[PDB]
Amino acid sequence: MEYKKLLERRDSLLVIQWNIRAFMGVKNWPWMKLYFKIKPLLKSAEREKEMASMKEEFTRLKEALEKSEARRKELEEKMVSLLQEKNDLQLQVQAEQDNL
Amino acid sequence: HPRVKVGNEYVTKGQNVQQVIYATGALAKAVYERMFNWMVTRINATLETKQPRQYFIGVLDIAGFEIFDFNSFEQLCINFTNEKLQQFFNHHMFVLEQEEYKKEGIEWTFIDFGMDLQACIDLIEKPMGIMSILEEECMFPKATDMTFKAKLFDNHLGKSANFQKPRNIKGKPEAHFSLIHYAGIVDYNIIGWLQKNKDPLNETVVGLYQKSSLKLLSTLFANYFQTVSALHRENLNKLMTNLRSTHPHFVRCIIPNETKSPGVMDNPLVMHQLRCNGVLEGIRICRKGFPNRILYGDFRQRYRILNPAAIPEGQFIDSRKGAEKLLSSLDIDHNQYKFGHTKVFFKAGLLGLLEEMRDERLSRIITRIQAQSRGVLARMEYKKLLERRDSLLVIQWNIRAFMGVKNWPWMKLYFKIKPLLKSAEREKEMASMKEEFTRLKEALEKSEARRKELEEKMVSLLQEKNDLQLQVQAEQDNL
Amino acid sequence: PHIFSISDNAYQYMLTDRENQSILITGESGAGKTVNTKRVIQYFAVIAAIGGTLEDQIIQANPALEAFGNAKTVRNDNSSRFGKFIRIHFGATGKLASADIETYLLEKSRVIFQLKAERDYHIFYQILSNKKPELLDMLLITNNPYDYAFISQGETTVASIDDAEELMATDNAFDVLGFTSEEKNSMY
Amino acid sequence: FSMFDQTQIQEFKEAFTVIDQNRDGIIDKEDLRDTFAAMGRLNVKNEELDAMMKEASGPINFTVFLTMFGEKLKGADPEDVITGAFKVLDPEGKGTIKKQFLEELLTTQCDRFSQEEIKNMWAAFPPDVGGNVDYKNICYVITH
Amino acid sequence: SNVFSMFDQTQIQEFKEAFTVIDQNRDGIIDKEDLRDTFAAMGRLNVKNEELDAMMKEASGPINFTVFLTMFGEKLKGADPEDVITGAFKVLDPEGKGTIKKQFLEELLTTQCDRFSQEEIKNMWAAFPPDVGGNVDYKNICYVIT
Amino acid sequence: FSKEQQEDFKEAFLLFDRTGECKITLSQVGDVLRALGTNPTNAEVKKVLGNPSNEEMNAKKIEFEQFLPMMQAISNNKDQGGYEDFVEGLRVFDKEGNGTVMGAELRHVLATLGEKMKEEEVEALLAGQEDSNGCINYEAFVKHIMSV
């Protein structure tokens, strides 16, 4: 368990190393180095920002909505079972009065 | 060497060969019986598609009446449990139905059919009955079947119309009693009943069962005053209380002949069964009485269709007075109906005639309406078949395009470049945007609706659950 | 006249009065209460079948409980030994919704003692009289019924029952009711 | 032009303007060589690259590009309507019908084409354990 | 080889607009004078010959349109990790503090990943000077990678 | 073993070696061979080493080429116990007979009575495997530890 956790964690660390190595690779001078780092580009930076912001809102609500829908189902299932239990209990109070 | 507790420490007792045999019998029985009730509880744990419930129809087969030459504790239980179901027939058809006529104030005279056996159910069920005795007796460790026989005879002989001394014409007068359950004689052998009612299990042996490697045997014995008589009794009393909240139809199944000869039909056995099932009385009360009644609001609205000029829409109409005018307008024999406080009363001739006139008047109007409904159903479905045909058409057209494209050598440009090109960048983006916003709106509104309604319903039922729980607490205190 | 008329009448009064209904099958032993019950249940099953898991399960809920519940007696070859009450639950749209089996008392005494001319419960002989040797040896029981004293007394072969098939039937009834193989084996 | 959705026209314009690698305004063999080597793989060494010019020798403009594709586009329709049409065609609306049902109906209801092409696609997967026609995969395999 | 990176990852065809629609000539190519508007796109710097050295190093000038696009596809390869990185950080420290010390991880990766030399450790130290907090902010790092 | 087996064995040592190429962990290497191959008793590791000093266990680092034979030798000690052999073990600690072992005496047994174990591992191995009553389904714990 220790062996596998160490290997997977160090492999992720190797990905993190690829990330920083990639940046030094990117510390070369192309036209894009100027335009990507600072935000002036309309369709790339602005439309991707719309993609990320809209998706961020949708996915957060997606979570909320799915978990909420489940929670509403769970309550329904609780009310259905409680409805059976409340009726059986109403019958049971008459049965108990018969016990008395 | 079963272990018994004496204070906080357990002591060991040596068993006799006869009493270890009897204990192994009791272990065989109690493992079997619990295995059966668990199998039922597992059936009740399936048989549940988790769908919201509003009406139930209860179908009951709670015993065959039986005589063997040798009848025992469960031959009492089975014959009694049916006995209550036929007395339920007596009460529903002759008490519950006939009382309603007098309550509604109909000019009706109550007729006594004489079919009552409540004295014999009270003979078993009451806190002085046979099953009540067998439960009060089996608590005493020093009780025995012979004194059970003495007290049992003393309490019922000369005090119950159904309890009589046995004749023992076929001999065997060691310890007998006979009980005249609704469909005839049943003789009973008292031997062994107390052990059967208590079912005492060797606590070391069941504690070892609880400790078993077999997950079933533990589950059967996990969580091993409450005799088999009392538990059965309370289930059957629950049965009748659960059943009185239903509208019943009775089915009298009749055995024709002892010998299983099919198509043969012995008149004495069948006629005696119709006598004990009180069916001829059910004919009398169905012919003489009033088999069907409908609430004034439900019927006035339902069959006003018979004469809409008697009950015009928009204009104010009293349901009782309107019903009086409508029925006077039908020109049917005025003696075939009666007027109640909240229910209309019909004979079976008038009920059937009103039923058929409603069916025909509805048929003339609604068959035209249904003809239109079949019009819309066929039109809309065959239009859907025309749309699915159109989709089939564009499918086969695009499949022809697909072959035409892949056999075309140019396909190398076509296939790879368009996923890279702007259409896949933006049209798919718009599609996802509209999909997410529409799903967002609908999911939000449906979940808020459901939660707000369902939380207040839940808390209302939970409060009622705690009130009745306190009632149960008062019961357990008194018991 | 038929029992199916009573079942239709109960479904009609249900939808019209908006009230719970019942069908109360009664008689002597050997008259058909278990089969008529199986027919009433067949009624609701096939009615919902034109308009299924619960549909089948309610039908099979009888024979699986029968094979344990029931023993050939002098009065009938297939007389059950336990009381049963079913509720069949329907939704607002009138389709089959749920069912609820309540059983009142098994004749537990029979498991160890039978008079002349009557069997122990059918599960005993149908596991002994067996087409499947694995059931016979996993219990490590002898194929001959007679050596086991408690089941063997009374009478153990009957004129009308193919116990090889009644075992097959009980096996199928637990298969459809979804008892797991470990549960079915443990109860055998 | 009325047959085309303006989306496909703009996509054809984007493809035509990106494909003219030398700002030629026309397509030649060398443009095809760079397009196949950059877009595809080194396996494009076959003579078939010379046969591609035989299909449309000489310079061709965007107008003839549109007319040639339009006639070649017979039986093609916009993906968005095909997605809607497939979702309507499914009874369940979710891509779970078996092939045998769809191939029998398509051959029966209209246009008795050869069975072998639809059969080869739909039986390319076993219909008893994988019969679910997840139409999004079908439409994309036709196109995307 | 280098053309495949452009095919593996996505969200990169959108960067071609950062060419296509920022070009001053709108004709289809990076000319030898696009720097004139790069100075305006940045705003705080002006004309230098080093921009011409950039234009010559990064590209051959106007010959081939695709070579610019594929140069950006060569840079693209970095975009793959963010799917994994969030999980890698949560598995690294799930409590939330993520107080991974700078000189700690500076000596961790050298021991864990490959053999980093002087120019590589120069680049690693320049990547984040040890702040007075003493810990690499996982959020700042991801935004930096962003 | 296959020639491709020794390479993937090698890179375990290559990740665990913090040196660029002269380390393999004399104190920790036998502990890792459990994962790559079969698992011994540590005393057998000490017997193949020939009973070194505890200070050696804390300070010494050994040479890998001599360790390749040790891989096989440590793999060599057959007659390891089977599933039934292990499951009848913890039953002697089970003073109930039902199939549960209380963790208050289970961790005690695993820590105090057998070979030494790093106690944090004893804390974290059963963590999440307990039930609400405070016991263990040891026939599951054994079929857990024999498999994965």
Ligand SMILES: Nc1ncnc2c1ncn2[C@@H]1O[C@H](COP(=O)(O)OP(=O)(O)O)[C@@H](O)[C@H]1O
């Ligand atoms: N209407 C009927 N049609 C066919 N067989 C019947 C009918 N009624 C009873 N039987 C037969 O009689 C026996 C008893 O039927 P059953 O429903 O078990 O009644 P009981 O439960 O009272 O014994 C069975 O063998 C059954 O096949």
Ligand SMILES: CC(C)n1c(=O)cc(N[C@@H](C)c2ccccc2)[nH]c1=O
């Ligand atoms: C009180 C009882 C005996 N009863 C009636 O007296 C009439 C009933 N229903 C009427 C409304 C009806 C007639 C025809 C078809 C369906 C329902 N139900 C009933 O349950």
Ligand SMILES: [Mg+2]
């Ligand atoms: Mg029966």
Ligand SMILES: [Mg+2]
């Ligand atoms: Mg060219």
Ligand SMILES: [Mg+2]
């Ligand atoms: Mg320019």
